[PDB]
């Protein structure tokens, strides 16, 4: 048996541990223990809370990869693990679109944002994204079994592609949508006086935070509707299937980036984490 | 844990209230009401409403300002200034019809001071009627004997703004200059806008996007 | 100056309900843990109920549970005790006492003046061995009590409280943790101790010192009263 | 100013006329201090957690 | 296959009357229907065999390494 | 002046020459042959997070358990440093406060800064809550320190160049202390409280007295403005930092320098300085965000109390001497030891 596809998804995963595990650990560690509790800093905090937990779930599914299946755990265990994944990865997504939500709401809205805005408010909407999460968590915790097969046993599991639309839906086009207006609305706030000086900054985190966002997410969302139209037994089909599992590492290789786009970004968390490193 | 219990239970519930005074309270715009002796502040204080210090609290557009009158303050201000960080602004009052070289020279110190870096400082120009009626009156080099070009009122007052704002060093921060002719209330709404944008600049800045 | 007033206390049927309200004023009741103590016409003080600030933690007798309600209205600043099923062993004088609970805080400072009312295992177990000290004015008199359980805790508070009962008056507090004097107590009053063995000596004993006697623990919940030294002239 | 000058002047005469110990002295003493109060320090002499109150 | 037994067994027998043959003979249905026409018996049963074998076959197929995430 | 400045300067080089005369042999060179205490660790062993804003000061009790600290977040909390418990919230009529103090009755906390009032807040009240006592308005300037003599008596340094010993019971200044050129940013009173020292802003610090109400001694031997001072505990020497980043031993007896606590590497100035119990390390705080111990016999840095994000404003030593207290502008309030 040999593959391509799945060493570069295994090289890119273990590329992912050691880029954002040690990042991802730090900059938790940091927001939990070193940093203060302003309302900034709530999301920095539970997005490596989710980044750390993906971090923490990947060695499940590189060991899943090293025997290109054969589930030896038993049902609970396959039922669990790929609904922690995919609680943590949403999460991430999700507090990125708070995150973009919050920088367009405290410019757009100064008055309100400096009244109705403290440290309550934003572990209200956390709480609510982490809810929101264990929902779009439950259809695979509810759906999963384990095929007895042959002597090696993979397990896996209408309703298949409405609750896959709906995960593209929420996961992909609310949060990328909200970026992109927010951070284009930040921009254009931005040439208005007292901000030209700006926006060859602005505009470049902006761009490079979308961009990553954009690129280490969509080849997911792109192959998971195309399995549903590729019809498997051909081999685009196994190629597609192949190409799933680089996929998986690119999405878990965002949670991996952001640590570094966001926490690092905020200068005088750059300079609490070099003071305590 | 006998009757620590309560003494706990205690302690939890005035840190409790700790917090809610501490939310409650940075609803509330600092700004630092500075400039020379005699120079409009007590007219532009009592312009917006309401011995040491003489903080004169107000809200506006369900804003609330908190101005700080601390011209009576007999003392150097370096061993007391540094409390007044975090403030959205400092408001500077110039007298434009007495004539200006100890407000340039406080307007320099205070600009370059190492708290106040960041915290940009509002610039008030009043009294223009009167500095108009002085021009017509007097020429504008008596305390200017460098400043060459036309006697008008327009010149003059662009010439009194640019040596206000040649004073700071740092681009993080502006100077917002505004003139008050001493007899008009909306000099608030300048004050209201600046505060904004300073709002505006700072979450910016705090959010690593600035 | 300080008040505390009780209401609401009259002949109840047996099997009835009735609300006791304690009326406060001339201090924060907020911020007090108010307390209520009972005591029997003929008998010692017995607590019932305990309420804290905010009305966080609601305690209660090992025979008042499951009965009884301890409310505060902090707006009104008055407290509240309501009963229900009103046995035949309730028929006793409710008494209402301020608490504030801290590092160096005096608990049972202050008594209510009382109403009364009338119906027609593990717990520490304090004994006063000494129910009648009859001593002339001029001397000594020292009033001992026993714990079943040691009082000193691990952070070194040995919890015995001592009252004072004037007949006719109101508990007044005379030393808080065995070893404090009130507020306002006379300096003559002295509270030693030692896990379990707890003496209350008093000199100079004068003519208007003359009342009855009660060490209370506070270690843990229910605080059980002794039996009560009564003390009388010659 | 002459009151001024004369205040000063009279405050200056008064500590003028304070006696005045050999550093030396002052020194020892110091030293005597800080050494026989040493043992009862519990910050250059570490104590042990089960006296430690903050433990 | 080992597992395919028991799956053949419940197809053969989800329906009534005989519930036999046609079944267990049954390129899907998109063509393979056309045969003498077998009779009004059993082309719905053959009909519904199709996608049930395919079904099974695609889950199993995607199954064999749905990498813990889709 | 011409008469009283010639008379004035001669008195100064007489004051100065005789100052010199007594100065034999420096405290470098008479305790070098004893061993220093070595690297101190100490480690944060409790943590006050209940203050919002900067802390300006910190005043330990007489029994070294409660702590009060003042923010400018208007508050004035008392802390159990055993169980890092708060037993007060004191809301302040004036946020704006520079200065904090603990009776050492127990029973008063004293409040002060821009108001130019030195308030009064009487903690065993019967009625429960706390209640301003007094408040005392005599100042023209800041007040910078406040010290409880007693119950009753207390000793005001204010930023109007002068220092005055109210009457609590009054609330009329019984006492008041002239002399300094420059604002009085500190003030430290004895362990006897029968005299106190005043470190002004003019590089100066006058030695007072209670009850005669007149200066005694001078020590004119900084740099820069003084903005913290700390008698030492045998009560006849004192220690003053100030912003030349250079904390120095004064002597009452000797009327002078001993040792000056200096470092090549440090810039910062002196917010705060406090004694052990011994004397032995005078753990003096810094703008450089750390409070370095440093040794009073040896002159050199012990260790460094690193762990605070902000210039620590106030550092306190308990009066048992188990634990030390750093206030730093970070909302802080670090217990170490």
Redesign the interface.
């Not at chain 2, 006998?2 to 302690?11: I, K, N, V």
């Given at each position: 048996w040999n593959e391509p596809p799945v060493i570069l998804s295994m090289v890119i995963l273990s590329l992912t541990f050691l880029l954002g595990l040690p990042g991802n650990g730090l900059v938790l560690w940091v927001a939990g223990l070193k940093m203060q509790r302003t309302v900034n800093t709530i999301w920095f905090l539970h997005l490596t809370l989710a980044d750390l937990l993906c971090c923490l779930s990947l060695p499940f599914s590189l060991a899943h990869l090293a025997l290109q299946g054969q589930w030896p755990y038993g049902r609970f265990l396959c039922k669990l693990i790929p609904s922690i994944i995919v609680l943590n990865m949403f999460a991430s997504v999700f507090l990125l679109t708070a995150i973009s939500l919050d920088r367009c709401l405290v410019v757009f809205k100064p008055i309100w944002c400096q009244n109705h805005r403290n440290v309550g408010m934003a572990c209200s909407i956390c709480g609510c994204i982490w809810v929101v999460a264990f929902v779009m968590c439950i259809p695979v915790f509810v759906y999963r079994e384990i095929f007895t097969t042959d002597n090696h046993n993979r397990c896996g599991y209408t309703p298949l592609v409405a609750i896959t639309i709906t995960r593209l839906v929420v996961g992909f086009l609310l949060p990328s949508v909200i970026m992109i207006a927010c951070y284009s609305f930040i921009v254009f706030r931005m040439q208005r006086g007292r901000f030209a000086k700006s926006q060859s900054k602005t505009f470049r985190v902006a761009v490079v935070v979308v961009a990553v966002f954009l690129v280490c997410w969509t080849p997911y969302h792109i192959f998971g509707v195309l399995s549903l139209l590729t019809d498997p037994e051909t081999p685009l089909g196994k190629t597609l299937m192949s190409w799933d599992h680089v996929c998986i590492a690119l999405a878990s290789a965002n949670s991996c980036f952001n640590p570094f786009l966001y926490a690092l970004l905020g200068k005088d968390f750059r300079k609490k984490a070099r003071q305590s490193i | 844990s006998?009757?620590?219990?309560?003494?706990?239970?205690?302690?939890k519930?005035?840190?409790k209230?700790?917090?809610e005074?501490?939310?409650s309270?940075?609803?509330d715009?600092k700004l630092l009401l500075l400039g020379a002796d005699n120079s409009g502040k007590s007219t532009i204080v009592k312009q917006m409403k309401i011995?040491?210090?003489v903080e004169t609290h107000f809200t506006f557009?369900?804003?609330?300002f908190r101005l700080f009158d601390?011209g009576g303050?007999?003392?150097?201000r370096?061993?007391?200034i540094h409390?007044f960080?975090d403030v959205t602004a400092i408001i500077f009052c110039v007298d434009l019809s007495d004539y200006m070289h100890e407000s340039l020279m406080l307007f320099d110190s205070i600009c370059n001071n190492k708290f106040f870096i960041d915290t940009s400082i509002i610039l008030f120009l009043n009294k223009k009627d009167l500095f108009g009626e002085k021009i017509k009156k007097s020429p504008l080099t008596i305390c200017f004997p460098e400043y060459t070009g036309p006697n008008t009122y327009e010149d003059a007052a662009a010439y009194i703004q640019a040596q206000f704002e040649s004073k700071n060093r740092s681009?993080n921060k502006?100077i917002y200059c505004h003139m008050t002719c001493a007899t008009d209330t909306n000099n608030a709404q300048v004050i209201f806008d600046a505060v904004?944008?300073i709002?505006?600049?700072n979450?910016?800045r705090?959010?690593?996007?600035? | 100056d300080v008040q505390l007033v009780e209401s609401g206390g009259g002949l109840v049927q047996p099997g009835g309900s009735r609300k006791l309200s304690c009326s406060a004023s001339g201090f924060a009741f907020s911020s007090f843990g108010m307390h209520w103590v009972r005591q029997a016409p003929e008998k010692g003080l017995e607590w019932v109920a305990y309420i804290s600030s905010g009305s966080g933690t609601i305690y209660y007798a090992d025979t008042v549970k499951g009965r009884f309600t301890i409310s505060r209205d902090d707006p009104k600043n008055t407290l509240f005790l309501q009963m229900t099923s009103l046995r035949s062993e309730d028929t006793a004088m409710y008494y209402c006492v301020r608490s504030i609970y801290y590092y160096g805080s005096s608990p049972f400072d202050f008594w209510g003046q009382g109403t009364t009312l009338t119906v027609s295992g593990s717990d520490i177990v304090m004994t006063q061995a000494t129910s009648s000290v009859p001593v002339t004015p001029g001397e000594s008199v020292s009033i001992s009590c026993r714990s079943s359980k040691s009082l000193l805790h691990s952070n070194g508070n040995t919890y015995l409280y001592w009252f004072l009962q004037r007949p006719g008056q109101s508990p007044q507090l005379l030393i808080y943790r065995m070893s404090n004097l009130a507020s306002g107590v006379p300096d003559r009053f002295s509270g030693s101790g030692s896990g379990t063995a707890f003496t209350l000596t008093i000199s100079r004993l004068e003519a208007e010192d003359v009342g009855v006697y009660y060490c209370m623990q506070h270690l843990e919940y229910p605080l059980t009263f002794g039996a009560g030294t009564k003390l009388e002239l010659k | 100013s002459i009151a001024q000058a004369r205040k000063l002047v009279e405050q200056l005469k008064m500590e003028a006329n304070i006696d005045r110990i050999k550093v030396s002295k002052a020194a020892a003493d110091l030293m005597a201090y800080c050494e026989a109060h040493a043992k009862e320090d519990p910050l250059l002499t570490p104590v042990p957690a089960s006296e430690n109150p903050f433990r | 296959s080992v597992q395919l037994t028991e799956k053949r067994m419940d197809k053969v027998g989800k329906y009534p009357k005989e519930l036999r043959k046609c079944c267990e003979d049954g390129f899907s249905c998109q063509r393979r229907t056309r045969f003498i026409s077998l009779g009004e018996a059993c082309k719905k049963v053959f009909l519904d065999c199709c996608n049930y074998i395919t079904e099974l076959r695609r889950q199993h197929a995607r199954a064999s390494h749905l990498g813990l995430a889709r | 002046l011409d008469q009283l400045r010639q008379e004035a300067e001669q008195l100064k080089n007489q004051i100065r020459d005789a100052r010199k005369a007594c100065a034999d042999a420096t405290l470098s060179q008479i305790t070098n042959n004893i061993d220093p205490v070595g690297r101190i660790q100490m480690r944060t062993r409790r943590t006050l997070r209940g203050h919002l804003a900067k802390i300006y000061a910190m005043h330990w009790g007489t029994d070294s358990r409660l702590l009060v600290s003042a923010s400018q977040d208007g508050k004035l909390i008392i802390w159990d440093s055993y169980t890092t418990n708060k037993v007060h919230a004191i809301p302040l009529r004036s946020s704006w406060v520079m200065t904090c103090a603990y009776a050492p009755s127990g029973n008063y906390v004293a409040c002060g800064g821009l108001d130019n009032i030195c308030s009064i807040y009487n903690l065993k009240t019967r009625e429960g809550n706390v209640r301003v006592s007094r408040e005392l308005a005599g100042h023209t300037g800041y007040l910078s320190c406040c010290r409880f003599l007693d119950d009753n008596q207390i000793v005001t340094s204010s930023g109007d160049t002068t220092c005055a010993l109210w009457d609590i019971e009054t609330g009329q200044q019984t006492t008041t202390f002239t002399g300094h050129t420059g604002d009085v940013m500190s003030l430290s009173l004895a362990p006897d409280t029968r005299l106190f020292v005043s470190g002004a802003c003019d590089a100066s610090a006058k030695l007072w007295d209670v009850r005669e109400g007149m200066c005694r001694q001078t020590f004119t031997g900084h740099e820069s403005d003084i903005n913290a001072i700390c008698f030492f505990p045998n009560g006849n020497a004192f220690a003053t930092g100030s912003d030349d980043a250079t904390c120095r031993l004064f002597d009452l007896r000797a009327d002078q320098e001993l040792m000056t606590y200096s470092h090549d590497n440090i810039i910062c100035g002196i917010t705060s300085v406090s004694f052990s119990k011994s004397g032995r390390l005078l753990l003096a705080g810094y703008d450089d965000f750390n409070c370095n111990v440093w040794d009073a016999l040896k002159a050199d840095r012990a260790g460094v109390l690193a762990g605070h994000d902000n210039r620590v404003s106030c550092l306190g030593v308990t009066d048992d001497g188990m634990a030390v207290a750093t206030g730093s502008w970070d909302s802080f309030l670090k217990i170490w030891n």
């Open positions: - | 006998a009757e620590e219990r309560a003494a706990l239970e205690r302690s519930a005035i840190e209230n700790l917090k005074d501490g939310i309270a940075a609803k715009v011995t040491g210090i557009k369900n804003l609330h601390v303050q007999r003392s150097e370096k061993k007391w409390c960080e681009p502006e904004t944008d709002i505006i600049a979450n910016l705090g959010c690593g996007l600035y | - | - | - | -």
